[PDB]
Amino acid sequence: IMLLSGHEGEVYCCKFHPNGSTLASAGFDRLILLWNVYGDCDNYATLKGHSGAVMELHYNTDGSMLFSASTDKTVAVWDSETGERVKRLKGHTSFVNSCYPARRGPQLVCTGSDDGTVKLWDIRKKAAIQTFQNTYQVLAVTFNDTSDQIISGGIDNDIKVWDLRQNKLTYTMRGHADSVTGLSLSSEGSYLLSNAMDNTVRVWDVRPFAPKERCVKIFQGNVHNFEKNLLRCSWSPDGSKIAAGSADRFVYVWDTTSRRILYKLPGHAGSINEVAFHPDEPIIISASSDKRLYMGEIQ
Amino acid sequence: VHLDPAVKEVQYNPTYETMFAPEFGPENPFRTQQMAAPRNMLSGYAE
């Protein structure tokens, strides 16, 4: 078990690097702190370029590029080796809640904001290529696996899937009762994990050939409290386990097959915003509003 | 199962089934409302 203090404020997001050897953490302090996973878990960055809260972190699939969506209306792209802010996408009129970069090349990025716009990008160009206008605020976006689709969840409860080729809404999924704070797509690309404020975590069949009712599995046991934070969700790399942020200070991991809890680990003092799995070894980190990151082995 | 109820500062990561499963046996009648609640200090639990 390892404890990683040193954020002055709430930790909203944390991600392992795809090679497993290094870790990124960021939150309300606006700084992005890069940690070694092994050894003394020492720090060796301060990334300083933002002016507002860092809402989400994502690496690209090779790990050279770190993407940070911020409430400052900008998306920063960092070089992981040098720590230089490579680019500033500044196209959004309101807070940027989320981002996610494409699995396959080229280096596309998509974004969701409280202005109700879902904007696609290309890192080569300074402007948005395409904007889908949602009627209400968007809290989390991810691509699909094929990099052709944006999936967005918002405060309008429904899950909306766009197609970049037709520029049109293509299918919608209904069942969640409240704001979709978090979306995450499995490494195989078949399934999506969703967290919503209705105290349910669900798995949906994202594949083209799903049944008409796409909700395959329902998980329970997390809590959303009065702080209404954007509690995120993540998959294990093998797809056997799922984790969800919960505001009741307990760190939840479910077995996807048996639908049981497997770990419900105490020790945080605040709302847990994101939980992430290490890619190779069974190490789990959980980021909480108590200004601490907890890292520990599971079996 | 394998985890004591009189425990603090657990050094490893216990499984759900090995930490949240019931304490067995009957309750005693010799404990009032204040005595049975999981208090840390005289009137209650402060965290």
């Binding site: 390892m2 404890l3 020492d42 300083k48 040098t82 105490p266 020790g267 | 999981p38």
Partner: peptide, 19 residues
Amino acid sequence: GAAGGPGIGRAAGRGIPAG
């Protein structure tokens, strides 16, 4: 590159709360 920051890692236990 970007400077080494204030963070330190250390070994810790968790400690379950009562209840």
